[PDB]
Amino acid sequence: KMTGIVKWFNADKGFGFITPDDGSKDVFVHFSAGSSGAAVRGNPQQGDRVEGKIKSITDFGIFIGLDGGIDGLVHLSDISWAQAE
Amino acid sequence: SGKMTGIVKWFNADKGFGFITPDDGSKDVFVHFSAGSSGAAVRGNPQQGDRVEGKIKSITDFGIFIGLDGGIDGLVHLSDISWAQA
Amino acid sequence: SGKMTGIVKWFNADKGFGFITPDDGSKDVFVHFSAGSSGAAVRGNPQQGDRVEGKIKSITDFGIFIGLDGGIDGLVHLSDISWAQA
Amino acid sequence: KMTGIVKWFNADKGFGFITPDDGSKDVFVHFSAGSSGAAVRGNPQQGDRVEGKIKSITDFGIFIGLDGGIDGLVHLSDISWAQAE
Secondary structure, X not given: OEEEEEEEEEHHHOEEEEEEOOOOOEEEEEOOOOOOOOOOOOOOOOOXXXXXXXXXXXXXXXXXXXXXXXXXXXXXXXEEEOOOO | OXXXXXXXXXXXXXXXXXXXXXXXXXXXXXXXXXXXXXXXXXXXXXXXXXXXXXXXXXXXXXXXXXXXXOOXXXXXXXEEEEEOOX | XXXXXXXXXXXXXXXXXXXXXXXXXXXXXXXXXXXXXXXXXXXXXXXXXXXXXXXXXXXXXXXXEEOOOOOEEEEEEEEEEEEOOO | XXXXXXXXXXXXXXXXXXXXXXXXXXXXXXXXXXOOOOOOOOOOOOOOEEEEEEEEOOOEEEEEOOOOOEEEEEEEEEEEEOOOO
């Protein structure tokens, strides 16, 4: 549960910057802007309340470029293999 | 992308890390997994060069925590976000 | 890649963040910058749709800090690494 | 300055896993394996000393996919524009 205050925001393009009530670190948010049941609200303004739920990224893949660079970061929903012996 | 099949370059199933060559594209993938993606059962490593399959999803909803020094202090899934109405 | 020219979608030069459409490829880019990449001089925003240039480098040498809960707790540049000899 | 101990390592492929002497978080390292002046040392083993220098990633670009996903993370060496007015 993350509660905080808008520093700046671009809801239409799905990103923003928030100061959480807890900890000492601000957060840049990116999200799919769209619909999930309620009518659209105004792009929030500096000082407005914002809430979200966050979860650790414990299951992921990092794609590595031919040059060794960071070429993507995905969620790993599942993985399977046949164990040796 | 959804389904990702490939072959194992290296694996450490005890610690939940692996390195895979996908059958598609030119980029290898490091994986970090828990029981969430791999299941509860204790499973030993696959052999290098054997098959491995997964399911992947783009991370579209995320937070980057920014440190006092301005660095990347954390990367999280943003499960839901809401704000006050104007 | 080196040189990256593009056009501004949105910008916040006061806080060191921006969003750019590169002239090359199909992917937009969010940038986070300090005086290290942007210079000391106070500069106001460019206009939306104007040109912007940068220089980029792949991050090949890095550390991912893993939290007690197994998450991504930090991402850093690894400037040098060494280990004991066998 | 980061000092720590090898948990596992693959020097030839340029990655590893370290427990730093400081803090409560382990670190997965990726690096370009190659030459920078000295002769090659053995892949380190569990319990071996490892050292490195780390720096915050303060100047970066994140590439966003057509689907909104994380499609790359680069270092931003510089950036320039003509300020409006």
